Each structure stands twice: as C-alpha cells, then as structure tokens.
Design a protein around this ligand. Structure first.
Ligand SMILES: Nc1ncnc2c1ncn2[C@@H]1O[C@H](COP(=O)(O)OP(=O)(O)NP(=O)(O)O)[C@@H](O)[C@H]1O
Ligand SMILES: Nc1ncnc2c1ncn2[C@@H]1O[C@H](COP(=O)(O)OP(=O)(O)NP(=O)(O)O)[C@@H](O)[C@H]1O
Ligand SMILES: O=C(C[C@H]1NCCC[C@@H]1O)Cn1cnc2cc(Br)c(Cl)cc2c1=O
Ligand SMILES: O=C(C[C@H]1NCCC[C@@H]1O)Cn1cnc2cc(Br)c(Cl)cc2c1=O
Ligand SMILES: [Mg+2]
Ligand SMILES: [Mg+2]
Ligand SMILES: [Mg+2]
Ligand SMILES: [Mg+2]
Lengths: 399, 399
C-alpha cells in the first residue's frame, strides 16, 4: 500500500463527507483512534497548526499578551458555577474513588478566574492579558468529525481583563481581525465577521462552497462584567465610584482551521496546501532516469537548486529516493498538496531550466534556472492570492 | 501586598523546603490550585519552559524528528498491556457511564505504538522519528512539589523506531547529550550522565548543593525490541532473516527543569535566572528622582539605552512606572531574578555612564554608555558561566 499509487476514491461534488475522509487519510493527516471522536494529528497536519501557532503567538505578544499554563482539571462544583452533557469526568485516581468528580476542562474560565480575582488588587494590576496553548475536551453529542468537531482538540484561549469597557471592546475587535487574518492571509480562505454568558460574541465565518454551509472559524467574546461579578475580580475606583468590576474578554481558535482548509481548498486529487502553511512549499523531483555520469550531474544540480531555494527562505525539499518511480512521487506529493512540484530531467538540464507544476491549477511552467529562486518566491505568492480569489469568486456568486 | 516590599521569609540553609515555597510564590512563578499537586504556571515561570521548548525543538528537528499530537486518552485494556496507583480514570462522560474506564495518559507508548505498527510496512518506512509537546498526568503517591513532582506536568516525549540496533543506540546518546546541554548551556547547571521496560535507561542527574541529593533531570530510554514485539512493529528483512522488529527509543524532559533551576541557583534574595532563559535579561530603572526638564531627559536617555540593547538582541525592558519607588523596583526584580539591573540617575547621566547591578553576585559596575550594548552582551555570558562554575565548584568539593 505505502509504495503504491493512490486515488481519491470518491468525488467532492458527489459525496463530500466521504471525499473528506479520503483526503485526510490519504494525505497522511490523521489516524483514527479507538476512543471515538479523537484523531491522531500526524506530522503533515500538525505542521499546519504549528504555522498558525507561530504566527498568532507573535501577533498577540505585540498586544501585550503573555503565555501561561493553567491546569487540565476543574472540580465539579467549580465548573457548575457557570453544556453538562459534554463533560468528561474523573471519578477515580490512583487507589481511591474521589469524593467529588473532577472534570477535564472544556474551556478554562472557571480554572483561571479565581486567580484573576486574587491578582487584581487595584487598577494598577490591570490589564491582565494571558493566553495558553493547550488541549480541551468536550464530549460532543453531535457527530464528531476530524478537525471540524473533535472531542479532544488543540486551541489557544486568551483571557483578558481591563479597567474600562472601552479598552476591552477595542481588544475584542483587534483579536477578531487577527483571526480573520489567519483565514485570509495564512489559509487563503475568505471570511465574514459577525456578531452571534457574555455581553456580545463575534465570530469569523468561512463559507464552504461544496455544501453551502458556514464554518464558525474562531470566536471573540466580550464578557463585560459578567464573570468579574461572578468571581469578584474588582478594584477600588480612583474617582470615588467605589468597587469596580474588571471588563473581560476571552477568545479562541482551534485545529478546526485545518478542516476548513481541507473542505474549501481540497479537490479531487487530494489536499491543496495554502503556501504559507505548507511544510514543504516546493518538492523537487528528478525525472527521465541511465548513464552514471548523467545521473550524478542531474542529482547534483537538483541539490544546488534545493540549496538556492532554501537560501531564499523557501521551504524546498528534494525527493531523490531511487526505490520509487517519478510517477509515484508526483502522485504522493499531489495527494499531500505540495504547492509546487519542480521537475528536472536531462532535457531541461541541457536548457538550464526546470519545469514547475502548480498543484492547485495543474499549470506547467518552464523557468530558467538563472533567476529561479526569486521567480519561485513570486510564484508562491501568486498561488496564495489565486487560491483566495477563486473561493471569493465562488462565494460572491452564491451570495 | 502587591505594591509593597517583599522578603524571602526563611533562609535556604535553614529550611530549604519552606524557602523553596517562598521563592516560587514571591517570584510570581506559580499559583496553588484546589486540585492537589497541580500548580498554575504564571508567565514568569512559563516563559522559562518556552525558552527550553524553542531550543530543544530546533535541535531535534536537525536530527530529523517531526512533531505530532496523539490523544490524551488511553483505554484501560490498552494501558494494561505494559504503576497502576498513579492513573486518573474517566468513568463518565456526557450523559453515560462508560462500559470501560479511560485513563489520562501518564506517557504515550500505548497511545502511539499501534499506529507505529500500522505505519511500518517495510524497512523503507524506517526510521520513524516523532515528538510531541504535551501534558501528562500521574497521580503521584509521593508528596507533590511544584515543578519537581506535579500530578499534571508539561513535557516533550520523543518516540523513535529504527531498522537496526546501532542507529537506535546512537540516537539515545545524542538525545542524552542534548538534555545535558539544556542543563549546562541553558540553565547553568552541571549534570552527570548515567545509566539507571527497556534494554537500558540513561538519565542526566543534577546535584543539589543545599541537601546533597540528585535531581533526575531527564530520561533517555533504549527500548530495544521489547515494545516492537509487544505491538508487532516489524518489517521483512531484505537479507533473508525473515520478520525483523523495529529498534525503538523514547525520551522525555519536563517542567522539572524549572524546579532544578530554583533549587540550585535560588538564594536568600529569591530567584536567580540563568541569563539564557530569562524573559527579562536586563531591567532598566531610573534612580534619584524634581525638574520637569531633568526627568524627561533622564527617561528619554533610558528609552535610548533600552532600544540600543534590544538592537543587540538583549531582552531589555524599561521600568518607568512612577507610582512606585526605585527601591520597590530593585526588590521586585531581584525577587524575580532579573540577571542585571541597569540604574540610571542624574549623576551617572552627566558622566555618560550607567550602573549595572549583577543579581547573582551583588556586584555593582559602572559602565560608559558608549560601548554599552556590546559590554552587556559580554556581561550576560560572564554571568552564565560564573553561575555554572560556582555550582560546579560546590559539586566537585562534596564529591
Ligand atoms: N469540538 C470542537 N472541535 C474543534 N474545534 C472546535 C470545537 N468546538 C469549538 N471549536 C472551535 O473553537 C472555537 C472557540 O470555541 P467556542 O467558542 O467555545 O465554540 P462553540 O461555541 O462551542 N462552537 P460550536 O460547537 O461549533 O457551536 C470555535 O469558534 C470553533 O472554531
Ligand atoms: N511528576 C513529575 N513531575 C514533573 N516532572 C516529572 C514527573 N515525573 C517525571 N518527571 C520528569 O520527566 C522525565 C521523563 O519521565 P519518566 O522517565 O517517566 O520519569 P520517572 O521514571 O517516573 N522519574 P521519577 O518519578 O522522578 O522516579 C523524568 O526524567 C523527570 O525529569
Ligand atoms: O468556551 C467558551 C467561551 C470561550 N472560552 C475561551 C476561548 C473562546 C471561547 O469562545 C464557550 N463554551 C463552549 N462550550 C462549552 C462546553 C462546556 Br462542556 C462548558 Cl461547561 C462550557 C462551554 C463554554 O463556555
Ligand atoms: O514514561 C516512561 C518511559 C518514557 N516515556 C516517554 C518519555 C520518557 C519516559 O522515560 C516510564 N514510565 C513512568 N511512569 C509511569 C507511570 C505510569 Br501511571 C504508567 Cl502506566 C507508566 C509509566 C511509565 O512508562
Ligand atoms: Mg480585588
Ligand atoms: Mg460547542
Ligand atoms: Mg509491519
Ligand atoms: Mg515517576
């Protein structure tokens, strides 16, 4: 099976739910697990989350947010301050039954806010801006789907507290725009910003052409003073007003991002990676291979190109495995969605050129080796915006 | 309490266990949590883990290791292939009792290796080199201690599989040396490499001067073929030998690293941060402050210095809060272990110099502003090696 060619066995436009399973399995993104609704994130899909993590982590740090880590556990009575058929319960640990069951966090408000109440002694302690990258568990009763609705998933959740409503409201929309940027500028997915235990909730919605539905892609909550009154997160007003309750937001985005990417950009040849989150942006494949002197000169030139592409900060890799055919390589990296295949054979070598095959469109482009690296940087940008505009044109048609 | 001065209330050499609690609380490293043996990682301590994570993640990627994410859950019968009084058990989820309890992973061998068995169809599928940054849970029956022995902790665990014993054994010792480098070159802690369900186990041991004990700082396992026979991770030998079982290692380091740092470098003034894992390496504090024209010229020069230190890639920050005294600032950043305080007042300003106060030793150094940034880069190196050599001299004395 591994060293054999592979086909997406059903068309996206015929049965998208079965097509979806084909793509995520044949592109080596997940493994099914014997605990239902949990899925292994294989490196090919986990790398996409790492790119999102690295980007968003840099952006919120510019806003003053610091990372932390709160516990996985919340006691039953602490959870039930302020859904119940979605909680996993620990009732035994070590050698003893617990007198009170412990919940796995489905979200961390009731884990974090007793500490926020302790940390806020005066307005000088505000703002508090904390984020954590972590796993949460929701025993989802709707049917689980890899990435889109899983019972364990990875996310970040940010939890912020301010001395005034206006600071908090301003951050809600900055965060919301950062979430839109993840979809638009990292995943090439157009989104709409909209207002859905808080004062107001805003999401980014990603339209899915094949079924006409919208993916709730991330959530930004303005909690007002609802949680700060619940947990007594308060300070003395400097201007005589007495006890003032902190103004709070929380916000989160998950590995559902990766399911949106599959649903929207996947096609009948398999995954199509948005270039900015592709762990391999360009795969270099030797083609048309006799002569010992020729095979060396050709592989040596491929190594040169590979180094020149990485010098230009392109994530290029070379596939010079000889126990497997070029045609198998084409198919493997197509199924996995590598944005560009660079083919180099004897004919192209003699013309000091390569042949680039663009995955999302199938276009073949012959390019001189001279200014190649710069031409490839441009091409990866071209692909990103073309992927985006193609979905945007589909959405602005149905709407 | 927050805007007041604070003292470590008991000496390290008098009661190190109570001294330890003083330091980790007053340096804002942790919060105690109402589930026993779990502790909040506040930003000041979580940033240390982030530095270790970023460094080690870069090193194992050079060895070909890829990141992934396997589930939190392992079914009872899968765990009990191959300690029991240390497992947290889920017995109810959503609306139903489970027919079989689910364990929180205490480690991920039994979560991962059924997938390894599926992925290894031939020797061409090897090596497999996977790592995950994640949380695990052990209901530790010995008494829990922040960082050193917690019931939830963060770690990485790497799990590798090779076609030959020699490849696997070579990686065991490369990983072990990377763990030694974390202690030696990031935390300024000398370690000894030693050989403790595997074929052999190697650890790095950090000597703790105040009580004479050794911290098991990380673990590198050579599993041989024990787990690959258990899980049938095997391939056909190309040379006629028949079924061959993969040769496996696993290896892990946790947030226990941070407890070693506190135990070994902490002193009676509080935390002392090894410079290479200090989120603030240098804190700039205006001292000796009347004149509106003078206060601006002094804060403006401090901002200049701060920018020049960051241009040199030094993690400098400026503390120009005016609602709190310089003496409070000295004490706050000492308790938190900032490697160097840079004091600038009117007298130094007129001599175009600053006064640096080195935290681990108390030494005060007057330095011209001219070549300051380069002098500070050197100083942070000097501090790292001096911290290391001071502990090494203590260990080579007791031994
Ligand atoms: N089970 C899940 N699996 C994966 N991602 C999820 C899951 N539930 C929520 N998310 C994502 O996490 C984000 C923040 O969480 P949250 O606001 O609590 O979601 P939610 O209101 O429960 N959404 P939903 O269940 O789809 O109606 C959401 O915007 C989703 O994109
Ligand atoms: N409860 C814990 N809290 C924090 N770190 C831990 C804990 N248990 C183990 N570690 C660390 O994780 C590393 C890898 O885990 P592992 O090899 O399974 O530890 P171990 O054999 O159970 N050690 P120990 O319990 O101290 O005898 C160890 O080398 C420790 O440094
Ligand atoms: O999880 C939330 C609110 C916000 N938390 C921080 C990240 C962004 C997120 O939108 C809403 N929510 C969603 N699902 C839940 C499921 C359960 Br089970 C519980 Cl107890 C609670 C909740 C619950 O509070
Ligand atoms: O966890 C290990 C072996 C290795 N796993 C990968 C990271 C490095 C680590 O040394 C040993 N170990 C330690 N403690 C355990 C506690 C329980 Br509970 C269980 Cl079931 C199993 C174990 C168990 O297997
Ligand atoms: Mg208060
Ligand atoms: Mg939900
Ligand atoms: Mg096999
Ligand atoms: Mg143990």
């Amino acid at each position: 099976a591994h060293h054999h060619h592979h086909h997406i066995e059903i068309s996206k436009d015929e049965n998208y739910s079965e097509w979806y399973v084909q793509v995520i399995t044949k592109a080596e993104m997940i493994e099914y697990y014997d605990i239902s609704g949990c899925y292994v994130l294989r490196p090919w899909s986990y790398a996409i989350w790492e790119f999102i993590q690295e980007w968003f982590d840099e952006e919120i740090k510019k806003l003053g947010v610091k990372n932390c880590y709160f516990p996985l556990f919340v006691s039953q009575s602490a959870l039930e301050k302020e859904f119940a058929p979605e909680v996993a319960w620990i009732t035994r640990a070590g050698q003893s039954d617990l007198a009170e069951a412990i919940a796995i966090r489905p979200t961390s408000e009731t884990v974090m806010y007793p500490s926020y109440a302790k940390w806020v002694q005066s307005h000088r302690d505000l703002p508090i801006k904390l984020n954590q990258w972590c796993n949460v568990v929701r025993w989802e009763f709707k049917h689980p789907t890899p990435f889109l609705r899983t019972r364990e998933f990875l996310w970040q959740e940010g939890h912020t507290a301010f001395q005034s409503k206006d600071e908090a409201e301003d951050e809600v929309f900055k965060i919301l725009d950062l979430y839109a940027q993840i979809y638009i500028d990292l995943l090439a997915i157009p989104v709409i910003k909209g207002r859905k235990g808080g004062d107001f909730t805003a999401t980014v919605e990603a339209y899915v052409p094949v079924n006409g539905r919208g993916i709730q892609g991330a959530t930004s909550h303005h909690l007002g003073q609802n949680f700060s009154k619940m947990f007594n997160i308060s300070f003395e007003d400097p201007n005589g007003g007495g006890k003032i309750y902190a103004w709070q937001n929380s916000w989160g985005i998950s590995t559902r991002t990766i399911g949106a990417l599959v649903m929207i950009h996947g096609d009948n040849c398999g995954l199509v990676l948005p270039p900015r989150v592709a762990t391999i942006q360009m795969i270099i494949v030797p083609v048309g291979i006799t002569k010992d002197e020729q095979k060396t000169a050709l592989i040596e030139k491929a190594k040169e190109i590979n180094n020149k592409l990485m010098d230009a900060s392109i994530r290029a890799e070379l596939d010079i495995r000889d126990h497997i055919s070029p045609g198998w390589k084409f198919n493997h990296w197509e199924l996995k969605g590598v944005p560009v295949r660079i083919e180099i054979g004897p004919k192209d070598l003699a013309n000091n050129q390569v042949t680039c095959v663009i995955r999302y469109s199938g276009e073949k482009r012959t390019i001189p080796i001279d200014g190649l690296a710069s031409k490839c940087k441009d091409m990866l940008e071209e692909i990103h915006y073309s992927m985006y505009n193609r979905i945007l044109e589909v959405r602005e048609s149905h709407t």
